Design a protein around this ligand. Structure first.
Ligand SMILES: [Co+2]
Ligand SMILES: [Co+2]
Ligand SMILES: [Co+2]
Ligand code: NA
Ligand code: NA
Ligand SMILES: [Y+3]
Lengths: 305, 299
């Protein structure tokens, strides 16, 4: 059934497990995610980016919200990385139960202002919100004692931010190639920093830009004729510990796209006479479902429904 | 707006134009068809076979029915080639407004009895129905099983069906006939003279040479494919055909675009990038088909 992002994330952090926020853009992806959730008897968050809102439109938001209601596990429909107030209004209009406004690339003061306005609007309609701080602001004049300490989230500032915005959950910069830290060092997790943040912020925490990108998956993609860089993803064990420390929401997208694309390639490379979409989109949908089920297993949400 | 298949088809036959029944199996196919209809300000029929039902499930039927209600043109959600009474009950359950009970492979009395049972159930819930008399098969080689005018009249009177699929030369697939497939327009006129209900044409995709060419060029493999000639469709419509089914044409277009995309961009794994243009090609095919059927500005 359909519930707020907070109902799901609060329980998750309380009970020490993670919930995957899986990005979907069409029917097959949405089906894959919900079936995985049902088979794993696990709560799940359906994530729709603005790219998804544009590509999928009313058809996608109709499915996400109505199918979420019919699910036998708790489901939340979440706007992934909203870039404007209007984008959030559109998500509220479409029945979303969780919204995220990303103004972390803005100065602390503007980020606060922008976020607070989204919070006020979302709360007026019973929707919870995810805000994002991903760089030392210097608010309490903290000095970056290191290059990384500069582009990553400061515990004290996070506490202030959440106190000021009233956001429900927070995405923090802790090492994953995302935001200011992007393209600036090897993908990792600053567990020490995560613990400090979690100590000052009891709200569930969110982890962005952290796909497993396992070797077998990349291998299959390359084998199917795909080309990709030396993709590096957070190590399974780190995700496991990050969750034990307070991360309740884990964004997942890349791994699904790769699996989906890999099988379509395999199907078309092997069956050149095939022009019935279902024959090649079907197994791709299945491959996606498998990735999702594995993520839920790794995150520890199996049977948490 | 969501309406019955008959509300759309009766008007079409009355006014001399054809409305397309386009088969869809997922979100992008459904979006393509509906956007084409809105841009052409044309009525349209969303066709979902039992296969589409199995593949798309609740997500597909949810989209078809609900989006039809929001469309600014008349739309009907049609069960294509229903094979049983219970398949029809599931379509009725899923909110369809049109259903086809297909038993043309059974003898006359059996086709009549089963079609009649479907009619009673569908009509009890305001749903109109399509039935099929005759067996679709190639002509040029009267026919062992084409639709008989008098039997057609008898069939519709006894079943109470709302529209009838007629066998006058077409067949499903990309391989209609050696060269231009022959359409018995004489036979169609006779049927139309005795059967006033709107008539339905199956396996009517064009399978244009350039589309086949574009498919092959992307690595696809297909033999000597041939569809029904545009001129035959135009005339068939003027003679009584109000519902023209199109499926193969959409599938070839979609697959061709996906192939070119993955061929040209091996580093692309964002599905919207190769699925999106394929959806665009489907939409274009639907729009040109509506042009051909004469349904533009008919909404
Ligand atoms: Co982010
Ligand atoms: Co047929
Ligand atoms: Co047919
Ligand atoms: Na997010
Ligand atoms: Na039909
Ligand atoms: Y048949």
């Amino acid at each position: 059934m359909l519930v707020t992002g907070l109902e799901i994330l609060k329980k998750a952090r309380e009970e020490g497990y993670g919930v995957g926020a899986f990005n979907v853009n069409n029917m097959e992806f949405l089906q894959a995610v919900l079936e995985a959730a049902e088979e794993q008897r696990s709560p799940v968050i359906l994530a729709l980016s603005e790219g998804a809102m544009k590509y999928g439109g009313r058809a996608l938001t109709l499915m996400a919200v109505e199918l979420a209601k019919e699910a036998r596990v708790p489901v939340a429909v979440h706007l992934d990385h909203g870039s404007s107030y209007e984008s959030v209004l559109r998500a509220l209009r479409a029945g979303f139960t969780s919204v995220m406004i990303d103004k972390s690339h803005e100065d602390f003061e503007t980020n606060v202002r922008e976020t607070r306005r989204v919070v006020e609007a979302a709360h007026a309609v019973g929707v919870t919100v995810e805000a994002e701080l991903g760089r030392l602001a210097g608010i309490e004049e903290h000095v970056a004692v290191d290059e990384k300490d500069a582009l990553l989230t400061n515990p004290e500032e996070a506490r202030i931010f959440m106190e000021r915005t009233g956001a429900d959950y927070l995405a923090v910069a802790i090492g994953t190639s995302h935001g200011a830290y992007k393209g600036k060092g090897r993908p990792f997790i600053d567990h020490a920093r995560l613990e400090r943040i979690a100590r000052l912020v009891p709200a569930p925490l969110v982890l962005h830009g952290a796909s497993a990108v396992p070797p077998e998956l990349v291998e299959r993609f390359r084998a199917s004729g795909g080309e990709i860089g030396e993709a590096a993803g957070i190590h399974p064990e780190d995700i496991k510990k990050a969750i034990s420390l307070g991360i309740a929401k884990i964004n997942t997208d890349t791994d699904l796209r790769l699996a989906f694309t890999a099988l379509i390639r395999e199907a078309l490379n092997k069956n050149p006479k095939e022009f019935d979409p279902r024959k090649y989109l079907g197994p791709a949908r299945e491959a996606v479902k498998e990735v999702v089920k594995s993520r839920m297993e790794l995150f520890g949400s199996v049977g948490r429904a």
